[model samples]
Target: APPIMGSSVYITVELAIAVLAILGNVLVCWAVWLNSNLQNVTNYFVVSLAAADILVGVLAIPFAITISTGFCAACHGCLFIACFVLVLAQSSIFSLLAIAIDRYIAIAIPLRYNGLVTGTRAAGIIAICWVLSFAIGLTPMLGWNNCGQPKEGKAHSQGCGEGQVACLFEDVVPMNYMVYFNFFACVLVPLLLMLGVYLRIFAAARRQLADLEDNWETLNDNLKVIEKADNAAQVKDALTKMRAAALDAQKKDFRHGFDILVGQIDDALKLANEGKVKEAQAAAEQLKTTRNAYIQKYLERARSTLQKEVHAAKSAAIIAGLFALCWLPLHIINCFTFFCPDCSHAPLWLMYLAIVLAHTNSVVNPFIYAYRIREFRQTFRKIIRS
Candidate 1:
């Protein structure tokens, strides 16, 4: 076995990584918190992720780092830290799951999206993630395991260092089963689900984009008709055709966009019917991305039709991705931890490095979203100057 915390050089590297992650994540959360405009359905996910990340840093990382620093004076501290880590880890996972599901619903059911994934629903979903995480974490902490045993279980001695005495092994089911289940349920499955959704969404979005381009072409043609028409009667006929073309393009664009939304809903229903809750949720999330882009694009095209153009949904897409990516490391680490229960075989520094890397997820969320969102930046400025 190897040290789960660290040595001097390893500690330094780990701290450096934590510092970067924490600062970035914090700034992002702060910006979103301040920015009123960024508080949309998609940004809600970003804010939620940032909040979870902050919790991970506050509840887990510091104590883990302290444990690495020196000898433990109290078992209570370690117990609390371990419990907190368990809770936070679960919280992050469920949050991710919720975000993915919400997105899918939003994209797939555009007409009903507001009713389905409204602010109240979003809040409820976020609450559910935390609640589920707590329940799972607490189960193992309770007498579900041998944690109540008199002696602190068998000590699988690692090295000569007196510092490595604190136990890393949990008195629960075999590490192998835990690893396998966790990897599939919490990590690999979610990743695959999300990946599939996003791919389909992109394909759908491209089709929709092509329709938008056609609308643009039609608008151009209408302008030509307006310019080239000869007499008043002829002009009136040209005007009718121009209007007809514009209306036709709008209808086509609407149909193309709505098709993606409907397809996503169908996929979600199909997966849910098949008992693929996780996959269904992922599908919904992908749809969310699609809908957000669709709405933003719809708005942009509307503006364009009115002769005013501006960018919209791209920022939302990026921010949503940012939230997903920030929490990605922990999910991966949880998988690895389950799969490689002997992660202890790695060097003390390496083990610490891995934990540090996993923990870094907490602080990465806020930075990812707030930094890129213009609305958030403006709000940040006002708050700072205030």
Candidate 2:
């Protein structure tokens, strides 16, 4: 087993990524689609991102893994590889950027945001992003420039003798451009944007919490006023208003948290049903995210209560770590190999393992969201039962 074909670990990782990614993303799509209230401009952006993750996880990973096993794809030809490369890179970058953009809008302009980021408009934005990414991908493939290495180099060209011209975008120039541009657009840009979005999001959340406290005080005062009033009718009217206002606020605050939980449960059950035991089990464990948050809220921070935000931040950190661990080493090693071909520490199989692990990140996300978010779990269960 010179690793020319496939290893047990490789196959296992592939199966894990595929099964988890499919079930996780599907539930995410379900949650977004089913909850009209959830379908804001921002969440729609998430839907688009999830769609890209799902696509790469399903369509690209299998082929990529197979190719990595032995270099050549057997039958597809250069045309297919060039097209495939363009699509996978572009879609992933666009989806991530969309997430950052949505988060920014949600945090920065909460009031005017309704008009600016409507569902239909969000869809339009996502469509445009995809088109832009696709266009960038196509430029190299169509021969506007080279994105990779000189296809097969001087030797391959000499072999061609008269006129082969290697695939349009397969040349070294285009390939390098493609890799760097994609890395910047998808990885660096998204990372920076997400950091900004989270900062703003935290600020907005803090503001919301302060308002909630103020409202609670105001509500208490109103309750006292009603209790002391001489007129029964007036008291009833005041109490009714207070009740309505309190309910609305509570609903608004808890909505995001509950949705996240529902997403988690959905992930677990879907995977379990699909016979993805390990991933489904892993998904089930995510339920503890919210549970642990509440426990900590009661024990450590008895005065404040926004467990949802805590849970979301925790999950986000995990995702960031996973992404870094999976990609950084592999890419660094690739660069090293490019510059120092004589270096002998890096094993090819290890490189493939790292790449496979990176792909697993896509699958892990939806499950994390679903198991930990309440509304997501409940809705998923309901949907499945029905």
Candidate 3:
């Protein structure tokens, strides 16, 4: 068969994607490294992601050319490139997951974010992510294949360096296992965890905003009580203490509210475990009411704070949504390809399109990071000038 992108135009498109992905990630790494202010713990994940994206640009994108032209046909180089793609892409996914966790801590537990996610901790996480990626990526090369056996109507490979080595050329049933494992571990699990964390972050932020008015009202009532007193000196002292307490509460971490909600959920589950069905149902109902009440409180807050909170949540949501859009199709296709016995009969364009889509995520990530994050954007501007 002729190569997938045998035509000049298609080859041009592939090269263009490779170039843009490399350039974007290079600029991202350059910007992050040059700016000392960008060296925060949160940004350590961003740098990790940039490093993975750069590898994707260098390793995965060019693999498309090899796929198209069969440049490394029936060679160990093919296996190496395939493993490179798997490791680099999985590293990028883990990097994004780390960023999501960092963002969740910053937004939901602002008071403890610095203490919890120190530079050392972030570095450790980045190292773990790379190690896990390499381990998973090396599965096929480490004798996880059914390459020697051939059965009627089943997938089997003649040799290790064949193009089909990456998929392990196993029976569809075992192939499905591989597919599900990769999908869940490398993609679905991390993304779902991130979504859950962001959901909690939004809920906690709303609860804090809702509680603000009650805080203000209590402070005001305390001030009024002080005003009613005859001793000016004592009244001044009371007002100062009240103001300090209010300020401290205003900066309180929202995680405390989330922890209380979690406790209520735990109590409801305990009731269920004890076979008290009705009581469990009631507890669940009350938990729902409390959640609604918190959101209602946020709605009743000052319009400016409400607006700011809503905008921040929406921005965080967009980041998650972009990730889903870029990677979901490729993973879904992979799941199908592995489970389907006749996957080789699938359209060539469909196969190539999935590969391109996967690479495109790496290209898109740096732009998203630069545009959405303030410090990164400032550093990006400097890069453009230099």
- How well is each residue in 177-257 modelled by candidate 2, as lDDT tens digits? 434664555555666766666676677667766766665565556545544555444444544555454444444324554
- The candidate maximizing TM-score is 3
- In lDDT terms, how accurate is model 3? 0.62
- Model 3, position 114: C-alpha lDDT score: 79
Point to the candidate with the largest lDDT: 3
Better of 1 and 3 by TM-score: 3
Error (Å) of candidate 3 at residue 168 is 10
Off by over 4 Å in 3: 1-10, 69-77, 149-174, 221-317, 340-345
Q: List residue ranges in candidate 2 displaced over 4 A.
A: 4-12, 69-86, 137-139, 144-175, 207-325, 339-342
lDDT of 3 by residue, 1-386 (tens): 54443445566766778888889988888877899987887668777877887777676767656555533233334445556677776787787667667766776676787789899888988899899999876665565544344232321333333333333222312454356766776668878887887787678767766666665565456545444545444444444555454345534224444444456556655665566555655554554454455523433454465555456455555655676787777667766766676766456576567666767777786777666767778888888987
Candidate 1 lDDT over 118-157, as tens digits, reads: 7777777778877877776555444443334412222323
Q: What is the C-alpha lDDT of each candidate?
A: 0.54, 0.57, 0.62
Candidate 1's TM-score reads 0.61
Better of 2 and 3 by TM-score: 3
